Amino acid sequence: HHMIREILKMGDPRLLRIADPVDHFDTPELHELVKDMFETMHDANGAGLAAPQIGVNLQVVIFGFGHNERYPDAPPVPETVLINPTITPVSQDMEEGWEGCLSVPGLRGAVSRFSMIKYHGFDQYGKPIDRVAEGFHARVVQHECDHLIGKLYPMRINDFAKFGFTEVLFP
Amino acid sequence: IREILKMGDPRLLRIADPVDHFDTPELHELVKDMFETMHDANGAGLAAPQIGVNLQVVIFGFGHNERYPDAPPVPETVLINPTITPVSQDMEEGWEGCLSVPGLRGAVSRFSMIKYHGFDQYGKPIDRVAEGFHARVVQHECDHLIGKLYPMRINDFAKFGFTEVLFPDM
Ligand SMILES: [Fe+2]
Ligand SMILES: [Fe+2]
């Protein structure tokens, strides 16, 4: 119980569900969840993590880094705890980019995401968060919020010519 | 035993050329290399593009196979320049893996019953009917010859994941 929480891998039914909202903030259980997620994400050099990825079906995501080894060309993204999120695209403009996932180890695929979003949610103390994001920041937020509705990035790919093993695509 | 290319390599996305000349030392050597590679990886089938050779050559078949432990014996076959004709449009879903997609399984709809036509490495005709897993592996291997891996054929990506998660008794 004191060991780092394991990341569930694609195929597990818990990655395919609708997460429930957090109803009570600033609780010992929620602080422990956030702590567990950061420890799990940092240990795996993740860019983000969603609670369903450690088997917790709650609307909690974390993301952010300065320099990240799995995505070495990505700019810094502010470290964030985002609970009960809503995403609103500012326009319908999209961009294709390469995504991975700690629940899909070893692979990358090209996924289109909105270029410009606003997002809203709360931190673990219940304080509102309201932000605008573009580019990779916007991409990570969309990827993580997808986990909360049971979506993994291969479900967003239409052209699987742009999908394969990281070591082959990025040697 | 030659290296099996992994998904992401552009050579797996090519449309393969037909074999022009049969019973040549070059073709026999290719077939031998494919069998060694396939058996060393416990493969159910293998296509020439998976070892980097852009030719319409596939092999398949076994008595028992550990990666598909429920599958019945499939005739050990060399199939060159193949064509597939469905007997009907009846489709069925089944779990597929691939040596070029190591570690994963996905549910893929295939024709339940097919006729298939081709040649062995000596140029003798092959004209068969197949159902079930035999028909599935023939469709899977012939897909490699037109640059297709099974993720291109999956309709429901909730039925795609790592083998040991989907099948923990493996
Ligand atoms: Fe993810
Ligand atoms: Fe294959």
Side-chain angles (χ1 to χ4, degrees), chain A residues 9-13 16 103-105 107 152 154-155 157 160-161 163-165 167-169, chain B residues 6-10 13 100-104 151-152 157-162 164-166:
Chain A
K9 299 325 186 288
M10 188 172 71
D12 193 287
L16 307 170
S103 291
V104 192
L107 300 157
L152 305 172
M155 290 167 196
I157 296 177
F160 273 84
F163 178 82
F165 290 84
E167 53 164 70
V168 175
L169 295 164
Chain B
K6 293 179 184 60
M7 191 169 184
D9 193 296
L13 304 175
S100 292
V101 192
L104 298 152
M152 288 83 165
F157 277 86
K159 297 184 192 171
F160 182 48
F162 292 86
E164 79 272 9
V165 176
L166 293 167

Short mmCIF file of all heavy atoms in Angstrom, two decimals, chain A residues 9-13 16 103-105 107 152 154-155 157 160-161 163-165 167-169, chain B residues 6-10 13 100-104 151-152 157-162 164-166:
data_model
loop_
_atom_site.label_atom_id
_atom_site.label_comp_id
_atom_site.label_asym_id
_atom_site.label_seq_id
_atom_site.Cartn_x
_atom_site.Cartn_y
_atom_site.Cartn_z
N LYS A 9 -2.86 -0.78 -18.08
CA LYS A 9 -2.48 -0.81 -19.48
C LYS A 9 -3.70 -1.05 -20.36
O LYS A 9 -4.67 -1.69 -19.95
CB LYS A 9 -1.45 -1.91 -19.76
CG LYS A 9 -0.13 -1.75 -19.01
CD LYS A 9 0.29 -0.29 -18.84
CE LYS A 9 1.70 -0.12 -18.20
NZ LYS A 9 1.86 -0.45 -16.72
N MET A 10 -3.62 -0.55 -21.60
CA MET A 10 -4.70 -0.69 -22.56
C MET A 10 -5.17 -2.14 -22.66
O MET A 10 -4.37 -3.07 -22.74
CB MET A 10 -4.24 -0.18 -23.93
CG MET A 10 -5.36 -0.12 -24.95
SD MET A 10 -4.83 0.71 -26.46
CE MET A 10 -3.74 -0.53 -27.14
N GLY A 11 -6.50 -2.32 -22.64
CA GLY A 11 -7.14 -3.61 -22.47
C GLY A 11 -7.88 -3.74 -21.16
O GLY A 11 -8.80 -4.55 -21.05
N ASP A 12 -7.50 -2.96 -20.17
CA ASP A 12 -8.16 -3.03 -18.87
C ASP A 12 -9.51 -2.31 -18.96
O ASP A 12 -9.57 -1.19 -19.46
CB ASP A 12 -7.29 -2.39 -17.80
CG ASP A 12 -7.79 -2.71 -16.40
OD1 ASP A 12 -8.82 -2.15 -16.01
OD2 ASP A 12 -7.17 -3.56 -15.73
N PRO A 13 -10.60 -2.92 -18.48
CA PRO A 13 -11.91 -2.27 -18.62
C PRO A 13 -12.00 -0.95 -17.87
O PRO A 13 -12.85 -0.13 -18.22
CB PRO A 13 -12.90 -3.30 -18.04
CG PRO A 13 -12.07 -4.24 -17.24
CD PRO A 13 -10.73 -4.28 -17.93
N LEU A 16 -12.00 2.40 -19.83
CA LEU A 16 -13.05 2.55 -20.83
C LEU A 16 -14.36 3.07 -20.24
O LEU A 16 -15.43 2.81 -20.78
CB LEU A 16 -13.30 1.23 -21.54
CG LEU A 16 -12.02 0.63 -22.10
CD1 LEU A 16 -12.31 -0.79 -22.57
CD2 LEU A 16 -11.52 1.48 -23.26
N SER A 103 -0.45 4.40 -20.45
CA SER A 103 -1.25 3.19 -20.54
C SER A 103 -1.06 2.47 -21.87
O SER A 103 -1.62 1.39 -22.06
CB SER A 103 -2.74 3.50 -20.34
OG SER A 103 -3.02 3.89 -18.99
N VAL A 104 -0.31 3.06 -22.80
CA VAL A 104 -0.05 2.42 -24.10
C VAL A 104 1.47 2.40 -24.31
O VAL A 104 1.98 3.00 -25.27
CB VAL A 104 -0.78 3.15 -25.24
CG1 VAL A 104 -0.73 2.31 -26.51
CG2 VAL A 104 -2.24 3.45 -24.85
N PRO A 105 2.22 1.73 -23.46
CA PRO A 105 3.67 1.88 -23.50
C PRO A 105 4.26 1.36 -24.80
O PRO A 105 3.84 0.32 -25.32
CB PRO A 105 4.15 1.05 -22.29
CG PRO A 105 3.02 0.11 -22.01
CD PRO A 105 1.79 0.89 -22.32
N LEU A 107 4.45 2.89 -27.84
CA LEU A 107 3.85 3.26 -29.11
C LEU A 107 3.67 4.77 -29.21
O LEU A 107 3.68 5.50 -28.21
CB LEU A 107 2.50 2.55 -29.29
CG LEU A 107 2.59 1.02 -29.28
CD1 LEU A 107 1.27 0.38 -28.91
CD2 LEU A 107 3.05 0.51 -30.62
N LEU A 152 -8.99 6.36 -25.15
CA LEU A 152 -7.55 6.23 -25.27
C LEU A 152 -7.19 6.72 -26.67
O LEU A 152 -8.02 6.63 -27.59
CB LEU A 152 -7.11 4.77 -25.08
CG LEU A 152 -7.60 4.15 -23.76
CD1 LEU A 152 -7.29 2.66 -23.74
CD2 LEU A 152 -6.94 4.85 -22.61
N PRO A 154 -5.63 5.75 -29.35
CA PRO A 154 -5.89 4.98 -30.59
C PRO A 154 -7.34 5.09 -31.07
O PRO A 154 -7.60 4.93 -32.28
CB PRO A 154 -5.52 3.55 -30.22
CG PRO A 154 -4.46 3.70 -29.17
CD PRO A 154 -4.98 4.89 -28.33
N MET A 155 -8.28 5.36 -30.16
CA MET A 155 -9.66 5.57 -30.54
C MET A 155 -9.85 6.85 -31.34
O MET A 155 -10.89 7.01 -31.98
CB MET A 155 -10.53 5.63 -29.30
CG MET A 155 -10.68 4.30 -28.62
SD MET A 155 -11.38 4.57 -26.99
CE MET A 155 -10.96 3.01 -26.33
N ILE A 157 -7.50 7.92 -33.65
CA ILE A 157 -6.73 7.80 -34.89
C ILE A 157 -7.62 7.24 -35.99
O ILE A 157 -8.28 6.22 -35.80
CB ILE A 157 -5.50 6.91 -34.66
CG1 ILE A 157 -4.54 7.54 -33.63
CG2 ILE A 157 -4.79 6.59 -35.98
CD1 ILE A 157 -3.33 6.66 -33.32
N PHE A 160 -4.04 4.63 -39.55
CA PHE A 160 -3.06 3.88 -38.77
C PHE A 160 -1.74 3.68 -39.51
O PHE A 160 -0.82 3.08 -38.93
CB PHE A 160 -3.67 2.55 -38.29
CG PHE A 160 -4.39 2.70 -37.00
CD1 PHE A 160 -5.70 3.14 -36.98
CD2 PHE A 160 -3.72 2.51 -35.80
CE1 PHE A 160 -6.36 3.36 -35.78
CE2 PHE A 160 -4.37 2.72 -34.59
CZ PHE A 160 -5.69 3.14 -34.59
N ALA A 161 -1.58 4.24 -40.70
CA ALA A 161 -0.22 4.37 -41.22
C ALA A 161 0.63 5.24 -40.30
O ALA A 161 1.86 5.06 -40.23
CB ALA A 161 -0.23 4.95 -42.63
N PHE A 163 1.04 5.29 -37.03
CA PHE A 163 0.97 4.62 -35.74
C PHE A 163 2.03 3.53 -35.72
O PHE A 163 2.23 2.83 -36.72
CB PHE A 163 -0.43 4.03 -35.50
CG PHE A 163 -0.57 3.27 -34.20
CD1 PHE A 163 -0.80 3.95 -33.00
CD2 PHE A 163 -0.50 1.89 -34.18
CE1 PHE A 163 -0.95 3.24 -31.81
CE2 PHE A 163 -0.64 1.18 -33.00
CZ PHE A 163 -0.86 1.86 -31.81
N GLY A 164 2.73 3.38 -34.59
CA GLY A 164 3.74 2.35 -34.54
C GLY A 164 4.59 2.48 -33.30
O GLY A 164 4.28 3.26 -32.39
N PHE A 165 5.66 1.70 -33.27
CA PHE A 165 6.49 1.65 -32.08
C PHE A 165 7.45 2.83 -32.02
O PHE A 165 8.04 3.23 -33.03
CB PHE A 165 7.22 0.31 -32.03
CG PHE A 165 6.30 -0.83 -31.75
CD1 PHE A 165 5.60 -1.43 -32.78
CD2 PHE A 165 6.07 -1.25 -30.45
CE1 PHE A 165 4.71 -2.46 -32.54
CE2 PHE A 165 5.20 -2.28 -30.19
CZ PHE A 165 4.51 -2.89 -31.23
N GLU A 167 10.43 3.34 -30.86
CA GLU A 167 11.81 3.11 -31.27
C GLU A 167 11.96 3.04 -32.78
O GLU A 167 13.07 3.25 -33.28
CB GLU A 167 12.34 1.81 -30.65
CG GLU A 167 11.47 0.59 -30.91
CD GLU A 167 12.21 -0.71 -30.63
OE1 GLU A 167 12.48 -1.01 -29.45
OE2 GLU A 167 12.53 -1.43 -31.61
N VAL A 168 10.90 2.73 -33.51
CA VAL A 168 10.96 2.69 -34.97
C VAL A 168 10.68 4.05 -35.57
O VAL A 168 11.41 4.52 -36.45
CB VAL A 168 9.98 1.62 -35.50
CG1 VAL A 168 9.95 1.65 -37.02
CG2 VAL A 168 10.38 0.25 -35.01
N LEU A 169 9.62 4.70 -35.10
CA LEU A 169 9.24 6.02 -35.60
C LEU A 169 10.22 7.10 -35.16
O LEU A 169 10.47 8.05 -35.91
CB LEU A 169 7.82 6.36 -35.13
CG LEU A 169 6.69 5.48 -35.66
CD1 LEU A 169 5.43 5.68 -34.83
CD2 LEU A 169 6.39 5.77 -37.13
N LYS B 6 8.93 -4.04 -37.16
CA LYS B 6 7.84 -3.64 -36.28
C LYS B 6 7.04 -2.49 -36.88
O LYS B 6 7.58 -1.64 -37.59
CB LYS B 6 8.37 -3.22 -34.91
CG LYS B 6 9.00 -4.34 -34.08
CD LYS B 6 9.51 -3.75 -32.75
CE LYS B 6 10.24 -4.79 -31.92
NZ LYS B 6 11.43 -5.34 -32.64
N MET B 7 5.75 -2.46 -36.55
CA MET B 7 4.87 -1.42 -37.06
C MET B 7 5.46 -0.03 -36.83
O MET B 7 6.00 0.27 -35.75
CB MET B 7 3.49 -1.53 -36.39
CG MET B 7 2.47 -0.65 -37.07
SD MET B 7 0.79 -1.00 -36.49
CE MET B 7 -0.14 0.09 -37.55
N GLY B 8 5.37 0.81 -37.86
CA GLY B 8 6.09 2.07 -37.93
C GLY B 8 7.13 2.07 -39.03
O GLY B 8 7.45 3.14 -39.57
N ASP B 9 7.64 0.91 -39.38
CA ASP B 9 8.57 0.81 -40.50
C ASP B 9 7.80 0.98 -41.81
O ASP B 9 6.81 0.27 -42.04
CB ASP B 9 9.30 -0.53 -40.46
CG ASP B 9 10.49 -0.57 -41.41
OD1 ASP B 9 10.26 -0.47 -42.63
OD2 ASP B 9 11.63 -0.68 -40.93
N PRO B 10 8.21 1.91 -42.68
CA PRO B 10 7.46 2.13 -43.93
C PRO B 10 7.43 0.92 -44.84
O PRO B 10 6.52 0.82 -45.67
CB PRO B 10 8.20 3.31 -44.59
CG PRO B 10 9.51 3.39 -43.91
CD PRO B 10 9.35 2.84 -42.54
N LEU B 13 4.17 -0.96 -45.07
CA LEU B 13 3.05 -0.21 -45.63
C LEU B 13 3.04 -0.25 -47.15
O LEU B 13 2.19 0.40 -47.77
CB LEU B 13 3.10 1.25 -45.13
CG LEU B 13 3.13 1.44 -43.61
CD1 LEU B 13 3.32 2.94 -43.28
CD2 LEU B 13 1.85 0.92 -42.99
N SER B 100 4.68 -8.36 -36.12
CA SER B 100 5.08 -6.98 -36.35
C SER B 100 4.39 -6.01 -35.40
O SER B 100 4.69 -4.81 -35.44
CB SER B 100 4.81 -6.59 -37.81
OG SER B 100 5.67 -7.30 -38.69
N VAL B 101 3.48 -6.49 -34.55
CA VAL B 101 2.81 -5.66 -33.53
C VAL B 101 3.00 -6.37 -32.18
O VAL B 101 2.01 -6.77 -31.54
CB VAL B 101 1.32 -5.43 -33.86
CG1 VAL B 101 0.73 -4.32 -32.96
CG2 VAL B 101 1.14 -5.01 -35.35
N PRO B 102 4.23 -6.57 -31.72
CA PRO B 102 4.43 -7.43 -30.55
C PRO B 102 3.74 -6.90 -29.30
O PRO B 102 3.74 -5.70 -29.02
CB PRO B 102 5.96 -7.45 -30.38
CG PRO B 102 6.45 -6.22 -31.10
CD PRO B 102 5.51 -6.05 -32.25
N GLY B 103 3.15 -7.83 -28.53
CA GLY B 103 2.59 -7.53 -27.23
C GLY B 103 1.12 -7.22 -27.20
O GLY B 103 0.56 -7.08 -26.11
N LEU B 104 0.45 -7.14 -28.36
CA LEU B 104 -0.92 -6.68 -28.43
C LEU B 104 -1.83 -7.73 -29.07
O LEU B 104 -1.38 -8.65 -29.75
CB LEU B 104 -1.01 -5.37 -29.22
CG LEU B 104 -0.25 -4.19 -28.60
CD1 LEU B 104 0.19 -3.21 -29.68
CD2 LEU B 104 -1.13 -3.48 -27.60
N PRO B 151 -4.28 -3.38 -37.04
CA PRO B 151 -4.92 -2.15 -36.53
C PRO B 151 -5.66 -1.34 -37.61
O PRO B 151 -6.62 -0.63 -37.28
CB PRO B 151 -3.74 -1.38 -35.91
CG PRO B 151 -2.80 -2.48 -35.45
CD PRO B 151 -2.87 -3.48 -36.61
N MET B 152 -5.26 -1.44 -38.89
CA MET B 152 -6.02 -0.78 -39.94
C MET B 152 -7.41 -1.37 -40.12
O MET B 152 -8.27 -0.72 -40.73
CB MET B 152 -5.29 -0.85 -41.29
CG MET B 152 -4.05 0.03 -41.40
SD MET B 152 -2.52 -0.64 -40.73
CE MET B 152 -1.32 0.48 -41.50
N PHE B 157 -11.95 0.15 -31.06
CA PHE B 157 -10.66 0.18 -30.39
C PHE B 157 -10.76 0.04 -28.88
O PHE B 157 -9.73 0.04 -28.21
CB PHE B 157 -9.89 1.44 -30.78
CG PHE B 157 -9.18 1.27 -32.07
CD1 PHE B 157 -9.83 1.51 -33.27
CD2 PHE B 157 -7.90 0.76 -32.10
CE1 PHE B 157 -9.18 1.30 -34.48
CE2 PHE B 157 -7.25 0.53 -33.30
CZ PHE B 157 -7.90 0.80 -34.48
N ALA B 158 -11.97 -0.13 -28.36
CA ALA B 158 -12.11 -0.70 -27.03
C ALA B 158 -11.68 -2.17 -27.00
O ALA B 158 -11.40 -2.70 -25.93
CB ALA B 158 -13.54 -0.55 -26.53
N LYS B 159 -11.62 -2.83 -28.16
CA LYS B 159 -11.20 -4.22 -28.24
C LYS B 159 -9.80 -4.32 -28.81
O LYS B 159 -9.55 -5.00 -29.82
CB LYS B 159 -12.18 -5.04 -29.08
CG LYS B 159 -13.57 -5.08 -28.49
CD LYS B 159 -14.50 -5.98 -29.29
CE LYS B 159 -15.94 -5.78 -28.87
NZ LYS B 159 -16.86 -6.50 -29.80
N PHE B 160 -8.88 -3.59 -28.19
CA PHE B 160 -7.49 -3.50 -28.61
C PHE B 160 -6.69 -3.28 -27.33
O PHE B 160 -7.05 -2.41 -26.53
CB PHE B 160 -7.32 -2.34 -29.60
CG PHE B 160 -5.93 -2.15 -30.17
CD1 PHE B 160 -5.20 -3.21 -30.68
CD2 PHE B 160 -5.41 -0.86 -30.30
CE1 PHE B 160 -3.96 -3.01 -31.24
CE2 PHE B 160 -4.16 -0.65 -30.87
CZ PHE B 160 -3.42 -1.74 -31.33
N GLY B 161 -5.65 -4.08 -27.11
CA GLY B 161 -4.89 -3.90 -25.88
C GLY B 161 -3.78 -4.93 -25.78
O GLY B 161 -3.53 -5.70 -26.70
N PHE B 162 -3.12 -4.92 -24.62
CA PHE B 162 -1.96 -5.78 -24.43
C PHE B 162 -2.39 -7.20 -24.10
O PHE B 162 -3.35 -7.42 -23.36
CB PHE B 162 -1.05 -5.21 -23.33
CG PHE B 162 -0.40 -3.92 -23.75
CD1 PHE B 162 -1.05 -2.71 -23.58
CD2 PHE B 162 0.83 -3.92 -24.38
CE1 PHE B 162 -0.46 -1.52 -24.01
CE2 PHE B 162 1.42 -2.75 -24.81
CZ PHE B 162 0.78 -1.54 -24.62
N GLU B 164 -1.34 -9.72 -22.36
CA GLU B 164 -1.42 -10.26 -21.00
C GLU B 164 -2.50 -9.59 -20.17
O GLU B 164 -2.87 -10.12 -19.11
CB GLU B 164 -0.08 -10.14 -20.29
CG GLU B 164 0.22 -8.78 -19.76
CD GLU B 164 0.89 -7.91 -20.78
OE1 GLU B 164 0.97 -8.35 -21.95
OE2 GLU B 164 1.35 -6.81 -20.43
N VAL B 165 -3.00 -8.43 -20.60
CA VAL B 165 -4.14 -7.81 -19.92
C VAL B 165 -5.45 -8.41 -20.42
O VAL B 165 -6.34 -8.75 -19.63
CB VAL B 165 -4.12 -6.28 -20.10
CG1 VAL B 165 -5.36 -5.65 -19.49
CG2 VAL B 165 -2.85 -5.70 -19.49
N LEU B 166 -5.58 -8.54 -21.76
CA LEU B 166 -6.78 -9.12 -22.34
C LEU B 166 -6.88 -10.61 -22.04
O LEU B 166 -7.99 -11.14 -21.90
CB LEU B 166 -6.80 -8.90 -23.86
CG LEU B 166 -6.94 -7.45 -24.32
CD1 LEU B 166 -6.62 -7.33 -25.82
CD2 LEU B 166 -8.35 -6.92 -23.98
#
